[PDB]
Design an enzyme around this catalytic site. Structure first.
Site, PDB file in Angstrom:
ATOM      1  N   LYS A 133      40.422  38.906  38.488  1.00  0.00           N
ATOM      2  CA  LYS A 133      41.673  39.439  39.080  1.00  0.00           C
ATOM      3  C   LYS A 133      41.569  40.832  39.693  1.00  0.00           C
ATOM      4  O   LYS A 133      42.139  41.040  40.772  1.00  0.00           O
ATOM      5  CB  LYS A 133      42.855  39.381  38.097  1.00  0.00           C
ATOM      6  CG  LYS A 133      43.162  37.977  37.649  1.00  0.00           C
ATOM      7  CD  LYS A 133      44.092  37.971  36.463  1.00  0.00           C
ATOM      8  CE  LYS A 133      44.511  36.539  36.159  1.00  0.00           C
ATOM      9  NZ  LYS A 133      45.617  36.407  35.172  1.00  0.00           N
TER      10      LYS A 133
ATOM     11  N   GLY B 161      38.115  33.322  34.677  1.00  0.00           N
ATOM     12  CA  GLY B 161      39.534  33.423  34.286  1.00  0.00           C
ATOM     13  C   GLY B 161      40.074  34.773  34.722  1.00  0.00           C
ATOM     14  O   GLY B 161      39.780  35.236  35.831  1.00  0.00           O
ATOM     15  N   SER B 162      40.798  35.440  33.828  1.00  0.00           N
ATOM     16  CA  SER B 162      41.410  36.723  34.165  1.00  0.00           C
ATOM     17  C   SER B 162      40.459  37.820  34.681  1.00  0.00           C
ATOM     18  O   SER B 162      40.880  38.725  35.412  1.00  0.00           O
ATOM     19  CB  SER B 162      42.246  37.231  32.995  1.00  0.00           C
ATOM     20  OG  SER B 162      43.465  36.496  32.882  1.00  0.00           O
ATOM     21  N   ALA B 163      39.178  37.732  34.314  1.00  0.00           N
ATOM     22  CA  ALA B 163      38.193  38.752  34.671  1.00  0.00           C
ATOM     23  C   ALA B 163      37.965  38.954  36.181  1.00  0.00           C
ATOM     24  O   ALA B 163      37.485  40.025  36.585  1.00  0.00           O
ATOM     25  CB  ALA B 163      36.874  38.481  33.963  1.00  0.00           C
TER      26      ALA B 163
ATOM     27  N   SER C  99      48.441  40.823  33.815  1.00  0.00           N
ATOM     28  CA  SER C  99      47.495  39.778  34.254  1.00  0.00           C
ATOM     29  C   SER C  99      48.223  38.583  34.942  1.00  0.00           C
ATOM     30  O   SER C  99      47.924  37.415  34.675  1.00  0.00           O
ATOM     31  CB  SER C  99      46.612  39.336  33.070  1.00  0.00           C
ATOM     32  OG  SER C  99      45.368  38.833  33.503  1.00  0.00           O
TER      33      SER C  99
END
Length: 450
Positions: A190, A186-188, A239
């Site tokens: 980016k 997921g966001s990790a 994010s």
């Protein structure tokens, strides 16, 4: 008189008696005993109980490694059993020691010093359990790394078991989740995409991009909130799925694939732990532009928490990706250059803004320090399809942000009470584990305590 010369009877029996080798001991980085053998044959003892359950694993009734480092280190840990030929009587009394080429002394196993610190392991264990119990989660995992050496300082999953009594332990209790389970980052992911786009000069500090929601054919790409424009800092801070996918869309499918591959996504780490997940990186030749885009915000590709923590070493160790160690190292291993020193330094500075007022992970803020972090929550994948109630929240970061020393990564699996967002559910254990770890390691605050 000379019993050795006589025929065997009911009262003189030739016996080959084992002289068992002593299995190697396992220690923490400071000398604390974690695994050792004692006579009963030999028996294995874990003095610290369930604390290093998943890392060390256990042996079977014959002293052979069955799981964890007991299994994968079996070759140097076991040693070589010896033997001697004796004459016994029916009570079992040794009557004579017999000349034989079979008489051999045992060679004890080799001792291992883990890179893990029991102080940090304790702090990780307690905080993980606190968060899991409070949020009524199914499970959780924490990895703590030395940000400069890639040494694992702590690694725990819950639920766990007593390795002194592995027989009652479930399959689910026994699983080393940090190494065996793949997740959507997921966001990790980016920061890596942003770092790549910066590293190759496809963007810079002061470019403002249009971050309005848009469409790749029919499939929409949007953020939580509409942001008309953001610079690279804003993209990090908020994010933004839009900004990230747009930056990724400035490379070809092959080039992004090679990059995710070089970060370790989709192959086994070969850390030395048994049961490593291979993760998931779909062949680039099958990518549509939507898929490249959703990968850029961490969907459609997968890696273990241990792999994610390792990728973060490219950010903390000045653009050089480190291999991980479970064994105590004198010095940082050679790694693989992923970004320029210049780029990594800039990107660390950017990530601080995720934990400050305005960022998406303010709960991972540590008093007296600049923390660079990412956080998020994905829907749980159960066999290539989504469930209804079920989410996985993760929080990952490093400190002191300018000159990192510690990476901490936390995942909480199926939180049921008191929130779903990674920033809250995995953020407080992150905060406590990080601050405690900095204190244990004797690292000075860089700004005053509020």
């Amino acid at each position: 008189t000379y019993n050795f010369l006589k025929e065997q009877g009911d009262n003189r029996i030739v016996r080959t008696q084992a002289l068992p080798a002593t299995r190697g001991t396992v220690s923490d980085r400071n000398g604390a005993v974690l695994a050792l053998s004692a006579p009963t044959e030999l028996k294995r003892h874990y003095p610290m109980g369930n604390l290093f359950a998943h890392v060390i694993g256990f042996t079977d009734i014959d002293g052979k490694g069955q799981e964890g480092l007991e299994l994968s280190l079996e070759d140097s840990l076991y040693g070589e059993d010896g033997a001697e030929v004796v004459l016994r009587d029916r009570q079992g009394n040794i009557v004579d020691s017999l000349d034989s080429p079979r008489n051999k002394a045992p060679q004890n196993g080799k001792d291992i010093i883990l890179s893990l610190d029991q102080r940090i392991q304790t702090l990780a264990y307690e905080e993980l359990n606190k968060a899991v119990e409070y949020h009524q989660a199914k499970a959780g995992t924490v990895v703590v790394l030395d940000a400069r050496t890639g040494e694992i300082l702590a690694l725990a999953n819950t639920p766990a078991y007593d390795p002194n009594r592995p027989g009652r332990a479930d399959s689910e209790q026994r699983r080393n989740r940090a190494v065996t389970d793949m997740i959507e980052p997921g966001s990790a992911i980016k920061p890596f995409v942003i770092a790549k786009a910066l590293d190759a000069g496809k963007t810079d500090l002061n470019e403002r991009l249009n971050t309005q929601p848009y469409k790749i054919g029919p499939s929409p790409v949007r953020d939580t909130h509409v942001y008309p424009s953001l610079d690279v800092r804003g993209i990090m801070q908020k994010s933004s799925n839009v900004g990230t996918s747009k930056l990724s869309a400035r490379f070809g499918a092959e080039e992004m694939y090679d990059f995710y591959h070089e970060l370790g996504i989709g192959v086994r780490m070969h850390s030395g732990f048994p049961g490593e997940t291979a993760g998931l990186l779909r062949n680039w030749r099958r990518w549509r532009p939507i898929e490249q885009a959703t990968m850029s915000f961490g969907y459609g590709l997968q890696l273990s928490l241990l792999q994610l923590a390792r990728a973060y070493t490219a950010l903390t160790h000045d653009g050089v990706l480190l291999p991980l160690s479970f064994e105590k190292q004198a010095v940082a291993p050679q790694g693989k250059r992923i970004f320029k020193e210049s780029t990594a330094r800039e990107v660390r500075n950017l990530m601080v803004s995720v934990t400050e007022p305005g960022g998406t992970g303010t709960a991972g803020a540590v008093d007296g320090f600049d923390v660079g972090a990412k956080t998020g929550t994905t829907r749980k994948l159960v066999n290539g399809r989504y469930v209804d109630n079920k989410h996985v929240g993760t929080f990952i970061g490093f400190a002191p942000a300018k000159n990192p020393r510690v990476i901490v990564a936390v995942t909480i699996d199926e939180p049921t009470a008191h929130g779903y967002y990674g920033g809250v559910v995995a953020g407080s254990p992150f905060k406590k584990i990080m601050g405690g770890s900095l204190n244990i390691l004797g690292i000075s605050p860089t700004k005053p305590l509020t």
